[PDB]
Amino acid sequence: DQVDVKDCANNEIKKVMVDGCHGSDPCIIHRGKPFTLEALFDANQNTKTAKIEIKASLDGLEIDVPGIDTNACHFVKCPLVKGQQYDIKYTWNVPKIAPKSENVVVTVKLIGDNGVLACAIATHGKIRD
């Protein structure tokens, strides 16, 4: 299933779904399931450059993206422009993790040179429900 995250790509994403978490509202998530927020997109701009701003903190899966890739190329391709397809993502091998995480923050965004290619924000979140 998917959620109601505040996606913000150009306007052509092919699929945006998180396995448990809830979008829009304070993404509450579940424990015991592989929570994996998704948000594919199809390069529709025109720039061989690629940036990024992903930042997801999980209960034992603190995924962060501090200027890691040189240009959003460590995960996908670097040149997005309107001649490439994507399939980024962010899974989470989920054991049990108990209820409520020490804290959560799901953010994201892909930026080329014409306009933010993709984007998705959950705004905080509290595992449990």
Swiss-Prot record:
Pfam families: E1_DerP2_DerF2
Top-level lineage group: Eukaryota
Disulfide links within the chain: C8-C119, C21-C27, C73-C78
Main location (coarse class): secreted
InterPro entries: Ig_E-set, ML_dom, NPC2-like
Further remark: The sequence shown here is from clone 2. The N-terminal sequence (AA 1-8) from clone 1 and 11 are not yet known.
Protein name: Mite group 2 allergen Der f 2
Organism: Dermatophagoides farinae
Lineage: Eukaryota, Metazoa, Ecdysozoa, Arthropoda, Chelicerata
